[PDB]
Structure 1
Amino acid sequence: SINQKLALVIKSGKYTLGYKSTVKSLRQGKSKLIIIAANTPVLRKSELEYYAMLSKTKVYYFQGGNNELGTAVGKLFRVGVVSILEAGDSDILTTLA
């Protein structure tokens, strides 16, 4: 599944969590794909979607709240957005995404 894919990234790849550090990555073009939680407010969503297209970065709308995304990355806290810095053994960068 998509989570099983995100699980692969987490255990073999480079990434960051949180809104401030995903813009650090988006400005430097380091991000290959950002994942956006369902309940993330639209203003932030539209803001990332602008940064992302200026970075020419793909954007996956996670069909789930920020609580679930935190579980998805395997953390006990919640995350609103993820940034894939390097895709590890996973294929998320070139798949249905």
Structure 2
Amino acid sequence: SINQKLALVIKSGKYTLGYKSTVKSLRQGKSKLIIIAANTPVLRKSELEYYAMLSKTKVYYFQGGNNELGTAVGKLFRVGVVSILEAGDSDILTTL
């Protein structure tokens, strides 16, 4: 399941949390996957979509709010968007 893939990525690979960090990563070209929560504001979501289009990285839409995305990413706070720079052990980049 996607939650298991995210947990494996957390344990093995490298990630950044938050809009500022993920936009920085997209601008610097080191981000590979961008996971955006279902309840992210539409303007922010479209901005991230444009950045990902410009930097040729893959975008996934998490079917769940920022609270659920934080729970899946393993932290006890809200994350509205996460950036996956390397999977480590998961095949999340190759899948979907």
Normalising TM by the smaller chain, what interval? over 0.9
Using the alignment, how far apart are the partners of 1:62 and 1:56 within structure 2? 19
Shift of 1:54: 0.4
- Over aligned residue pairs, what C-alpha RMSD do you find? 0.5
Distance 2:18 2:5 in 1: 20
Following superposition, the deviation at residue 24 of structure 1 comes to 0.7
Corresponding position of 1:64: 64
Structure 1 ranges of 4+ moved more than 3 A? none
Residue matched to 1:38? 38
Q: Deviations over 1:35-94 (max 9, x none)?
A: 000100100000000011101011000000000000011000010000001111000000
How many Å apart are 1:27 and its aligned residue? 0.4
Q: Give the structure-2-normalised TM-score.
A: 0.98
Q: Give 5+ residue unaligned stretches, structure 2.
A: none
State TM-score, norm by structure 1: 0.97
Q: How many percent of aligned residue pairs carry the same amino acid?
A: 100
Aligned partners of 1:61 and 1:17: how far apart in 2? 15
Q: Distance in 1 between matches of 2:75 and 2:45?
A: 22
Structure 1 residue 23 displacement after superposition: 0.7
